[PDB]
């Protein structure tokens, strides 16, 4: 009971971090905490190994997604030198005036 309520409270806190962050790294912190709480809550009935396999598959697929998000984070920091959303929407068209390939890759990994 307490384990379930602790995991759901950590889920709530990590989702609030996700939706309140102003930079992509803090939002990645909330993102991965949300994924961890999803893993810990899906395999709540740990006695059945099928629940554990389901939690495994969930965390692995979401971790592949988070690796793509990390790809986008690396590209955006290498291009614009910042991870703040407003700073992206401020100095993105000035930097990508000539080439748009790296921004296209960043948006693809964001997707």
């Amino acid at each position: 009971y307490s384990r379930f309520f602790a995991y759901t409270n950590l889920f709530i806190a990590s989702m609030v971090v996700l939706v309140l962050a102003d930079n992509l790294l803090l939002m990645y912190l909330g993102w991965e905490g949300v994924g961890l709480c999803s893993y810990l809550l899906i395999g709540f009935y740990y006695t059945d190994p099928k629940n554990g396999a389901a939690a495994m598959k969930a965390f692995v697929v979401t971790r592949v997604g988070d690796v793509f998000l990390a790809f986008a984070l690396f590209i955006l920091y290498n291009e614009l030198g910042t991870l703040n959303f407003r700073e992206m929407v401020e100095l993105a068209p000035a930097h990508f005036a000539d080439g748009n390939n790296m921004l296209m890759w960043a948006t693809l990994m964001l997707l």
């Binding site: 395999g43 190994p49 554990g52 939690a55 495994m56 965390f59 971790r63």
Partner: peptide
């Protein structure tokens, strides 16, 4: 490789402390 790291950490956790 970080994805693989998550994979083996989950494998250790579910083979050691979870299940019957």
């Amino acid at each position: 490789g970080l994805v693989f790291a998550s994979v083996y950490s989950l494998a250790m956790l579910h083979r050691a402390y979870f299940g019957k």
